[PDB]
């Protein structure tokens, strides 16, 4: 779906997160909330898909004599048909669920970005590559407030207004 | 001005998986469900009861 460009080999502590760059330096930091949700979901998904397969055991093959060729062919047909059915189910579930897994992760990306955008409606400016430039100073406390979803827009609204309108 | 970015993980893993839309997709983390090797030994399960 709405995929992106770029990768973050430096962020080693989670599926998703931020790269902050302020007066106090720069750094990577993983969003523990959304990655935690994604890990919960993918774990429950893998477990459900696998648990459905778990059913009963049964010694597969049967041996029939020379006056029983036909029920013998029917038994081999049954064994082999259950083999095909289970193989096909496993194959397609693998394929489709890897597809849907990548899509789920993409959507998590989108959700995180839109959350941050709603917090920083006007006080910042969308760079385009998937970042934000602040029209004000966002120090470490400000960064953390944005990261845990408690950014204070009226706090910096006036500073951002002055700088933003100074540009134009 | 200060900048704040959003991104996601990458590593040196070469694990390739297939999807319906695309095949040999290299991913960060994967699990092989298929066991495809054996020791080649008719060994005992909990006792040398095998005859």
């Amino acid at each position, epitope marked *: 779906a709405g995929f992106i460009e770029g990768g973050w080999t*430096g962020m*080693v502590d*989670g599926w998703y997160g931020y790269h*902050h760059q302020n007066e106090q330096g720069s*750094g*990577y*930091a993983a969003d523990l909330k959304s990655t935690q949700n994604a*890990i919960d979901g993918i774990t429950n998904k893998v477990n459900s898909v696998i648990e459905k397969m778990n059913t009963q055991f049964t010694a597969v093959g049967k041996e029939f004599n020379h006056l029983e060729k036909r029920i013998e062919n029917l038994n081999k047909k049954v064994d082999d048909g259950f083999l095909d059915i289970w193989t096909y189910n496993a194959e397609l579930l693998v394929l489709l669920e890897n597809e849907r897994t990548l899509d789920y992760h993409d959507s998590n990306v989108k959700n995180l970005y839109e959350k941050v955008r709603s917090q920083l409606k006007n006080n910042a400016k969308e760079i385009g590559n998937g970042c934000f430039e602040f029209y004000h100073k966002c120090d470490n406390t400000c960064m953390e407030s944005v990261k845990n979803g408690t950014y204070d827009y009226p706090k910096y609204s006036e500073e951002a207004k002055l700088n933003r309108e100074e540009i134009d | 001005g200060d900048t704040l970015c959003i991104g996601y993980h990458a590593n040196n893993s070469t694990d390739t998986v297939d999807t319906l839309l695309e095949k040999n997709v290299t991913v960060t983390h994967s699990v092989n469900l298929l066991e495809d090797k054996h020791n080649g030994k008719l060994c005992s399960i909990n006792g040398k009861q095998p005859i």
Partner: antibody
Amino acid sequence: QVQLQESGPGLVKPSETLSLTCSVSGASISSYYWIWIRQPAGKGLEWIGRFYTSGSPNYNPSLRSRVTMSVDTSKNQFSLKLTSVTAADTAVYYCAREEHITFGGVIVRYWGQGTLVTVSS
Amino acid sequence: DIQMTQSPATLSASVGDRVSITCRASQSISSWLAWYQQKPGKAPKLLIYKASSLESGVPSRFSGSGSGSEFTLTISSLQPDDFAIYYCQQYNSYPWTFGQGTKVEIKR
């Protein structure tokens, strides 16, 4: 193997600055978060905190005011610096490596050897 | 933030007996608990992560079961080398918290 050794003074005077240095064997410290954890004698364990070279550290609240974590990429080490030690913080220290993302969250497989820091006059 | 009740403090069981250590949490966790074994004056060694992930090289006798607020470490057959203090750690939310630990002795 990645191996973590620990160097501490053994004694710190009650109103001084504890400096501890964990040395790493064969890993690029710049690419891992590094954790400090501690145990008062035979009592329970306490997560001190986490630091990373191109990231943002995070420390335990009760020690936050006093802890600074740094990293020497030149010497391949990372150091704790605790201000205003108290003799109650008199314990074994351990340094651990925070491994990368796995399916079961983040793991600390590697562990230091533990050094006693006792705070006495 | 997150308070850890690891019962019971002291145990002593004969070889081969099953052993269960309970690690209740102040707040529920989506099975992000881990179990470590600390030998006498030695580096604590992790046993199981994700409350269900037996770390590589750990004997299969160890099984971790739990999600939400209740988790249990279960040693299927207690062996001599399994005498130590066992701690349960939580990496759901900082600050990372441990239990007071459970000392597992051996009846001989």
